[PDB]
Amino acid sequence: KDSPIIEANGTLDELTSFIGEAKHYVDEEMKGILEEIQNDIYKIMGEIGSKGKIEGISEERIAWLLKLILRYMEMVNLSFVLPGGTLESAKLDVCRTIARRALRKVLTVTREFGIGAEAAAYLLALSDLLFLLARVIEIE
Amino acid sequence: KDSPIIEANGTLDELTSFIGEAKHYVDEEMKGILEEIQNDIYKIMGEIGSKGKIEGISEERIAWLLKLILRYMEMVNLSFVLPGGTLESAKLDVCRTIARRALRKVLTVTREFGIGAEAAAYLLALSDLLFLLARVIEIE
Amino acid sequence: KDSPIIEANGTLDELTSFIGEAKHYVDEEMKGILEEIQNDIYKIMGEIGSKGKIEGISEERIAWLLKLILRYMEMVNLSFVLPGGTLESAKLDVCRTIARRALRKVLTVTREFGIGAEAAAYLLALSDLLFLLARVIEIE
Amino acid sequence: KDSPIIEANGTLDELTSFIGEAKHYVDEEMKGILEEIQNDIYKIMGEIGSKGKIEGISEERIAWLLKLILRYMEMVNLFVLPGGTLESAKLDVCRTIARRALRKVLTVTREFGIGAEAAAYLLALSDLLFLLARVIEIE
Amino acid sequence: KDSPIIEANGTLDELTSFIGEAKHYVDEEMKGILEEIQNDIYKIMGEIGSKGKIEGISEERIAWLLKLILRYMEMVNLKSFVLPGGTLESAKLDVCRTIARRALRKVLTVTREFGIGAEAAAYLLALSDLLFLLARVIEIE
Amino acid sequence: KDSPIIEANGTLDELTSFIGEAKHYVDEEMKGILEEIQNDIYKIMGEIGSKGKIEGISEERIAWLLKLILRYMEMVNFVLPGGTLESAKLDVCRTIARRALRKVLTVTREFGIGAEAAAYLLALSDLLFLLARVIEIE
Amino acid sequence: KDSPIIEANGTLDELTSFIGEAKHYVDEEMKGILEEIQNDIYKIMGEIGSKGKIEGISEERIAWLLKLILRYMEMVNLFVLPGGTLESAKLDVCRTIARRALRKVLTVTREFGIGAEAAAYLLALSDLLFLLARVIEIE
Amino acid sequence: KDSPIIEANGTLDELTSFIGEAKHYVDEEMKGILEEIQNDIYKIMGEIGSKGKIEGISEERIAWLLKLILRYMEMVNLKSFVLPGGTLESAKLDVCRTIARRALRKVLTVTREFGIGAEAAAYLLALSDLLFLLARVIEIE
Amino acid sequence: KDSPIIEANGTLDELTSFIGEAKHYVDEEMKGILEEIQNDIYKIMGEIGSKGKIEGISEERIAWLLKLILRYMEMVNFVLPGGTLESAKLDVCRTIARRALRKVLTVTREFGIGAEAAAYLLALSDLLFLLARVIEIE
Amino acid sequence: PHLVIEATANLRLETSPGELLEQANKALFASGQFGEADIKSRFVTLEAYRQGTAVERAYLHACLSILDGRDIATRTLLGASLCAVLAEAVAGGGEEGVQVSVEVREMERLSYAKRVV
Amino acid sequence: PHLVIEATANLRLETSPGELLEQANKALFASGQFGEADIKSRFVTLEAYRQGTAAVERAYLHACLSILDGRDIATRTLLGASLCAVLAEAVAGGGEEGVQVSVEVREMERLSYAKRVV
Amino acid sequence: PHLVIEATANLRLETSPGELLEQANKALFASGQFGEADIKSRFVTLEAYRQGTAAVERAYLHACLSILDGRDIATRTLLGASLCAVLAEAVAGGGEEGVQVSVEVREMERLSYAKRVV
Amino acid sequence: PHLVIEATANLRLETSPGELLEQANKALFASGQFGEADIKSRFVTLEAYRQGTAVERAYLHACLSILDGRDIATRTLLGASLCAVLAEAVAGGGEEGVQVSVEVREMERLSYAKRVV
Amino acid sequence: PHLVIEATANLRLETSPGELLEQANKALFASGQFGEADIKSRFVTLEAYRQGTAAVERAYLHACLSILDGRDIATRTLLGASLCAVLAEAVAGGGEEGVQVSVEVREMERLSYAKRVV
Amino acid sequence: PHLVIEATANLRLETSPGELLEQANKALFASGQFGEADIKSRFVTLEAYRQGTAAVERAYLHACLSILDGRDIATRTLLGASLCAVLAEAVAGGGEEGVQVSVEVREMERLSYAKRVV
């Protein structure tokens, strides 16, 4: 119940809730992706809240996000754009910024306790995926 | 104007604003509850901003939330669920996570200045009520 | 890549994203104002991220917000009101509370590094403008 | 209940008590002045003890001491040792205590931001007590 | 040898001296009480000065002050704040009271840092209350 | 000025004032001694207040107190403070001189000044003790 | 791998080794008791080394030592110098080491919040070892 | 003169003394090994006590322990945890092992603060492993 | 009891126990010496444990050890520890006495007590050294 | 956790001690901080009591003992929750209002023993 | 504050529990630390008790004063001493040896303490 | 030290309350932390009780040991374990399920504690 | 707060000094930091002035004094707000551009006296 | 020290500016903080002024005392209070409402302050 | 930077305010701390003034240099000394005694300072 453990779980909970809202603004495919993400976040929270005693996300989950990222990078061509081109993409840009906030809190935990490196990697990859999904909505 | 006083009011303001949005996605009964909550939050902000000089929420308000919590617990049957089952419930899950963030900031104030214990209790009870209301929407 | 630099950019990014959502709930005039604001925020992020190496917003931008503020103050008559009178105004109240959070982070950067005083002034003026715009929507 | 709050009230209490003794060695006019001072000190103690929540002395009280100071400077030839007469000695003791009270009040002001008027009052008081003592010796 | 031990004994000595003056302004009964108090203070100084190696005041001494306090409370009726020094004699006891409070603050510092003197502090606290009442009694009588 | 300089002068001023009161309760001889002491205290305050820039008491003053102390020790044979009213005043002065000493020593430890002043104040507290006993005896 | 974790396991290992020597100087009954202690002293090392991740000794083990302590107090007349006989000396050495192990375990408990039962066990152990030594001298 | 230098030599001295006792419970071969070890420990103490100004053990000594370790590992077959002290003689070596580990911890503190003794620490680490194996060999044989 | 106090008594207890073992490996004369030492150690533990409140060893005890040391130095002419089994036991006791000394010195540095105890323990470690050599010689 | 409720003999409750204890346990359970079977409550009636120095009075006091390691919000809320339950159970007593109070105290966790027979 | 006085069944008091409680409340009130109506005391007689392991008949009296926190040590120590003197004075005797009388003064966490009036 | 043992009315003990208290005092005495005559214990039977919210007959036994402060954690933990074992052994049963037995060990502020002997 | 505006004699303003001061007070009031009746401003024309060492020049300078205890964003924004007001009031003057500047300074709060007659 | 007194044109004083300045210097001198010849004061009348935004005729008086640094807060606060009282007494009135009178006491950096006498 | 020079009405200068201001700007420019076009100076004559409490006629000259912050003490001290010398040499005399001449060098907060050019 160390300060940074609590704060990191707090933020991850907040992230999950924002995704929970965003998933009602996307299609069936993206919804399925976002639900998988919410489940992965819960695994991350278990690991952090328990200070490493409970296993978190497997390497498979990071690999899964990376595969989606390549899938989507192939369909995204950007110059500079502002956040929120459409309403639906806006929701994902908000989720992205929160995932980054969650990452900062997770990294604090990693730096002080030595746990969560995979979680941090996942959250980092997640913020990249959320970026791309938002751009895809605007494009399509 | 101490750092933690400012930060706590900031967060409470943010909480109130999120509730202000959520109240447009709920029915007349829940809207009335949420407006009462926004008023109570303002009383809390007065107390914190003034470092205890201004009286905050009475014990009646905490008792009020507890009565609502029992009312709703009786109607809620949960296993594990993800946040945001419906759009409307998602808004309340977001509010819940913010109320917890507000609590963390209020507790910092309590620990350093000795004020806000009731406010912290209220915010804690609030985060429980918001959880239940969200589940009720999904159920109904 | 100092802690407060990162955190401030994080928050400014989050602010921009929230504005990006809000702009889909307002009319053409306010949308145009909000897009100008998102562009100004990017200039602020450049300056902060680079620790002052990159020039940020000009004095013209602060003057621009101040002119809008006077325009809107002339049309706003308030007693105390709760956040979110309408759905659209609620979105701007949320943006306002975030702009204040961004300001707190920017001020931390200013206090430690000596940069961002104009950015902080801009964000302060912005939080005042967002307040007024929200009230205008409720009035109209 | 903070250390410096307690210590400052302690000293102000001690000051008031010393004035309470001195007032029995002076005439009716000075006695009346000293009783008003004891009342003002009580108000100062309220403000300090409550950490600023309770209002202390008004600007009127500081102005009052300043008027008395001018009244007395006009009739005082102003180096002597303390205690020229027994009665003046009592006021010199009160003066030194008022200065001790001031030092404690200033610590409170520096730490908490309260009591600036109280400190000004105590400073003016230590000047008044000085002059009153000299007046007794002269008269 | 330690700053707070020295300072506390200093203050207790100062207290005793002030009582020594005040006792010449009171009647035979109060004088007897004040002399008992000066003796108790010396026992306290022994304990504080020796850092707890010398026994201080026994429990009976606090009980003694408390009995006097009840005796005097029964004879004192105040309705509101009164200024210190209603009479010359009462003034002397108000000064002693304020010093006892100063002695207490110094003794408490010693207690907090070294773990000694809790009874002494209790005694000084009770003493402050007794001196207050005695002063009021003089003004009343 | 620095906290300990201010506080030490404060206390020395308070000491002087208490002596100023006590001198009205003693005879002509002791009064003369006490006035010399008040003058010496002022000289000490100059030195402490100026952080050593102004010369303080000469070695003759300590020697003077020591001569008086021997004079009085020869005439003095546990008692409570204040045997008589007059002796009580000197016991109060004694306890204050010790408080002044503690403050002067803090200054000495921090700034390296005032060692003679501290010695004087120490000797003074011994003289005041003896004078008080002499009054009770006589 | 934290300093106090390592030091505590080190000491517990040293304790176990000393018991391992002492058990060759006692009879069959005490030997059996000492072997159980060495096993219990190992479960304690697991818990400490793993910072609480691995469960240590159960309440049954503490209860077991307490029962033995009562058994032995009943037959011990309870000041002597350590080592009345050679065999008792070995147990007095083990006792002093168990106390050293306890001090290290307590440091771990204070810093990390783990090992309270282990500390209780080690405390009870040092009492048992004391009594066993006295029993040997008596018998 | 520095706390950790002193403490480390203290512990190394204690280690040497325990080996000195253990060597009277072993056969001629192990006794010869243990005496070589006591001499190496003295070289280590020289280096530590002198804060690196006196040369300590050579690389050859570490290599020597490693050769003995392989010799003995080949003759030791354990399947699970065994309690210390299977025989009286092995018990003595288990005690020596635990002390060598204590010596190592103290030597490492010196290394971390002063930058000296890395070979000594390696030697003590290898020694701890050798003493373990020798103890097991006695129980087996 | 603060930490240094506890740790020092712990070590002194451990020392006493090791002596208690060693005394069964020596002759009647050395056994008598070692028992006197165990009693002195207890006296030291009283002083350390009570933070100086209880008197420790008298100066006679240090003088006693010094007399024994001279007696034995006269009979003793680099060797490894443990020449014989019996001498080994005393070499172990010696190293522990030094550990006890280090802990006692920490107590002395922090609390100002135990200087004689430390001197005794230092002299003891010298005596134990010599006794061990004597056994090997004889 | 352990809940001890002390009532004076002249206190009149709206319901029986049995019912009050059941309500108190529900209130504590609902906090989410406790296992159902762990909440142990007991009610005590006081026959020898005095309140103040002056008038017939009655009072109700409860003391909740919980294991440590909880924050202030949690403890404060547990206090507030029980206090409301106890207060609503009071019909009256004596000739003045009834003071109702709740203490929430923490029990040292490391030293707390628990066994089940 | 709350004062609980526990007496063994075989303890003989000079006066009734009623009078003892009144004296205790006066003693506490007189400390100046409490409001009159807030001092709540209760007396308890113990029927099942033991003291020590010896077979000698014994009796005891124990009180525990619970006050809200935020008081110094002098105050707490003096409250203890004050009550202890009252309790001791009120003991007539009981058992086959002297009666032990004791007082604990404990602080109650202030922020979490709930209070209301019906 | 003070030991208070609270049992529910429906708890069945192997021994009488008297016997349990004697065993508890022996267990505490044996710890070496207390003087024999100082160990004061008392047994209380609870008539009005409820455990949990489920409609299952239950019984429990709880003890609270109050000792003066200044002891370490090993000592407090062991005192807890020692008493708990005694209390557990004395339980025959009660209710419709296993009996929870627990022990709290709390410290009493030492400086403010008063003690007199009449 | 106190606002002092110093203009050189050869500066030409778009509005009268009266009008400029009114605009400045509106700008300050609008910041939300001040009470309406507290804002005190004054305009000063300088007859004896020089700028630099080289050319006819004119300048306008204002100094806003506020009580302390405000953050940097607030002070910076007050500066920016007034500067814009002053700048838009300048028609020109001299033969070069007109420098316009604003200082925002804090006044010690504890020592500041205020009375109303 | 330097004292600057600014008054609006529509302010009516009881005394002339000359007299006010003399009183102010006496008040400052009397503080004991300054040499007599060092106290320099000046009075300024403002012709172009505005107070607030409301269309109400107003008048004000402001003074600013600049002293060298190195003084405590009591001293600065008292100097402020002393001057403010003098200034307030001198106001007869002006405008359509009460006159605000205020005094700032500011410190001047001592090390950099230059002073020469011609 | 901003330089304000205040002179009493009865002060006689060797030259006109114009020339004095030019000399002051040269002196400041020469310090190397300022751009030429940024040095803004102004001269003020005081008609209502007093110095001390004595009746002797007096005159004074005071200047205040305001510079942006971020300079060291040597720089500020030297700027003070430089201007003070310029001002002193411009004084012919005035009043019945020597003229006091002084210079304050103050820093202006840099981050909040607004500047623009029309």
Automatic annotation (TrEMBL), chains A, B, C:
It comes from the Archaea. Keywords: ATP-binding, Metal-binding, Nucleotide-binding, Transferase. Residues 1-136 form the Cobalamin adenosyltransferase-like domain. GO terms for molecular function: ATP binding; corrinoid adenosyltransferase activity; metal ion binding. Mg(2+) binds at D128. This is Cobalamin adenosyltransferase-like domain-containing protein. The chain holds residues 23 to 163 of 172 of the full protein.
TrEMBL record, chains D, G:
The keyword Transferase applies. GO terms for molecular function: ATP binding; corrinoid adenosyltransferase activity; metal ion binding. This is Cobalamin adenosyltransferase-like domain-containing protein. The chain holds residues 23 to 163 of 172 of the full protein. Keywords: ATP-binding, Metal-binding, Nucleotide-binding, Transferase. The lineage of its organism: Archaea, Methanobacteriati, Methanobacteriota, Thermococci, Thermococcales. Residues 1-135 form the Cobalamin adenosyltransferase-like domain. Mg(2+) binds at D127.
UniProtKB/TrEMBL annotation, chains E, H:
Mg(2+) binds at D129. It comes from the Archaea. Residues 1-137 form the Cobalamin adenosyltransferase-like domain. GO terms for molecular function: ATP binding; corrinoid adenosyltransferase activity; metal ion binding. Transmembrane segments: none annotated. Keywords: ATP-binding, Metal-binding, Nucleotide-binding, Transferase. This is Cobalamin adenosyltransferase-like domain-containing protein. It comes from Pyrococcus horikoshii (strain ATCC 700860 / DSM 12428 / JCM 9974 / NBRC 100139 / OT-3).
Automatic annotation (TrEMBL), chains J, M:
It comes from the Bacteria. Pfam families: CHMI. One of its GO terms (molecular function) is 5-carboxymethyl-2-hydroxymuconate delta-isomerase activity. SUPFAM superfamilies: Tautomerase/MIF. InterPro entries: 5-COMe_2-OHmuconate_Isoase, Tautomerase/MIF_sf. CDD domains: CHMI. This is 5-carboxymethyl-2-hydroxymuconate isomerase. It comes from Pseudomonas aeruginosa (strain ATCC 15692 / DSM 22644 / CIP 104116 / JCM 14847 / LMG 12228 / 1C / PRS 101 / PAO1).
